[PDB]
Amino acid sequence: LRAVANVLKDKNIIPGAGAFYIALSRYLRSANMNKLGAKGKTKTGIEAF
């Protein structure tokens, strides 16, 4: 009942079945090489995440 109630209150929805986890893991990996605006040692924390 609470999962359905959150759809009415919060108009935003996200797909499941690992759709958000796979898309976010691949995006952050390729974006770190194009940006390079943090630090060299930060790549270890971004790749591990």
């Binding site: 108009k11 929805i13 952050l28 974006a31 790549k43 270890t44 924390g45 971004i46 591990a48 995440f49």
Partner: protein
């Protein structure tokens, strides 16, 4: 997340950079979260959905 960071701990990586890299990736994940989310209409015709 501790298992993936365990390999870096044995190599001499300080845990602060490991944690600082997570906050940077968390802020970048919020920007991708706004583009990835889909707004659902409040209309009552979504009962089928």
């Amino acid at each position: 997340l501790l298992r993936q960071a365990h390999r870096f701990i044995q190599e001499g990586v300080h845990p602060r950079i490991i944690t600082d890299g997570f906050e940077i990736a968390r802020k970048e994940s919020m920007k991708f979260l706004d583009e990835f989310k889909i707004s659902k209409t409040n209309l009552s015709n979504d009962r089928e959905f």
